[PDB]
Amino acid sequence: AGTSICTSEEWQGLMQFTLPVRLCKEIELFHFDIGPFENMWPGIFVYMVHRSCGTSCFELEKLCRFIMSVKKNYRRVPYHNWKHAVTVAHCMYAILQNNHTLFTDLERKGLLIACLCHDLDHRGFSNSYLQKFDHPLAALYSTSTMEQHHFSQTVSILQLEGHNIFSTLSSSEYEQVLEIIRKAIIATDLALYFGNRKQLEEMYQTGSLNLNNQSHRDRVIGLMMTACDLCSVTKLWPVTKLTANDIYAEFWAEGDEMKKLGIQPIPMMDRDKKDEVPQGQLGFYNAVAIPCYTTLTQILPPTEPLLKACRDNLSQWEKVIRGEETATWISS
Numbered sequence: 001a002g003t004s005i006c007t008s009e010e011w012q013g014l015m016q017f018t019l020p021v022r023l024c025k026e027i028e029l030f031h032f033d034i035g036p037f038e039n040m041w042p043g044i045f046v047y048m049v050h051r052s053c054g055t056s057c058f059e060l061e062k063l064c065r066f067i068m069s070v071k072k073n074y075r076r077v078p079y080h081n082w083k084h085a086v087t088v089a090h091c092m093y094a095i096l097q098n099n100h101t102l103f104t105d106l107e108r109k110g111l112l113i114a115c116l117c118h119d120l121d122h123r124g125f126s127n128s129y130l131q132k133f134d135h136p137l138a139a140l141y142s143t144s145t146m147e148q149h150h151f152s153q154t155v156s157i158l159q160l161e162g163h164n165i166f167s168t169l170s171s172s173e174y175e176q177v178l179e180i181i182r183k184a185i186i187a188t189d190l191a192l193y194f195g196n197r198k199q200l201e202e203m204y205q206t207g208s209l210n211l212n213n214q215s216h217r218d219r220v221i222g223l224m225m226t227a228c229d230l231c232s233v234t235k236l237w238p239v240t241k242l243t244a245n246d247i248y249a250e251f252w253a254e255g256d257e258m259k260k261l262g263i264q265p266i267p268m269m270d271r272d273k274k275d276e277v278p279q280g281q282l283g284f285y286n287a288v289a290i291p292c293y294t295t296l297t298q299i300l301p302p303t304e305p306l307l308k309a310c311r312d313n314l315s316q317w318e319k320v321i322r323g324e325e326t327a328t329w330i331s332s
């Protein structure tokens with residue numbers, strides 16, 4: 001209720017943070033897992049912004065206040081949380097570094113920010129749930145319900161005193177960047193991914209894809225956002241498997257609320273149907289993740305390691321289905 005604001009101690013701490021030298025090299029790689037470095041996550045974001053956009057892209061104070069306030073407006077939910085925000089932002093960084101000059105300075109700063117912000121104030125409930133039970137948000141936002149709220153939260157944080165990192169842009173560039181962020185955030189609505197990917201595959205296979213065409217650029221950026229949102233499936237298996245535990249914790253919690261409202265949940269959301277999880281993963285990788293990274297690699301060749309990793313993880317789920325799993329550790 002209201003927008004939360006970081007403490008002076010919080011942003012000043014981030015300002016003096018220094019990244020360990022050994023991680024510099026690691027942060028460049030797609031498969032990098034932020035997991036073991038929690039105290040460093042905000043500093044990792046500063047580092048990526050500085051490397052991609054320059055140490056003078058944003059005023060350091062406004063940037064540190066922005067980052068720490070963004071953190072404070074992620075809720076303590078199992079998956080759609082601050083950890084996921086930084087993971088998605090790190091994926092975008094790796095994509096941008098590998099494709100740097102395809103994107104404008106305005107796009108890079110807008111996308112890194114869009115990724116950090118893209119699940120702001122997530123409550124651990126899906127668009128399906130909010131619309132089924134007519135939460136106030138579904139009244140306000142008829143489609144892409146959570147995504148429109150995440151954008152609105154982004155704008156609220158920028159509006160906090162001393163938090164507007166984009167103020168020094170020309171009025172034209174300011175409006176362009178807010179549009180980059182809005183489109184990028186909305187694009188993380190998976191309902192829109194299916195159409196976008198089919199369109200892109202079509203433009204690619206016929207050779208009409210043209211990055212000089214703004215509607216094409218917007219669509220390629222949308223698929224980048226999907227790729228980054230889903231990137232837990234491109235990590236090393238143990239990391240992917242552990243993250244799946246977190247995702248399913250939210251799903252099962254939503255399913256439990258549905259049962260209280262007299263409605264049996266979809267199996268994916270049913271904690272009494274865990275046997276169906278490996279097949280559900282197969283379905284998800286075949287329907288969403290594999291096609292995503294497949295098309296993204298056609299359009300941006302350097303992103304090929306995301307697709308190779310996603311394929312390796314599909315193989316691991318297939319192993320699970322056939323009863324070939326080995327010992328597994330969980331944090332419960």
Ligand SMILES: O=[N+]([O-])c1cccc2ncccc12
Pocket residue numbers: 229230233244247268280281284
């Ligand atoms: O939507 N996801 O982020 C996601 C990630 C990994 C596995 C999933 N399985 C089913 C639905 C969504 C999934």
Ligand code: NI
Pocket residue numbers: 118119146188
């Ligand atoms: Ni989301």
Ligand code: NI
Pocket residue numbers: 084088118119188229
């Ligand atoms: Ni997300």
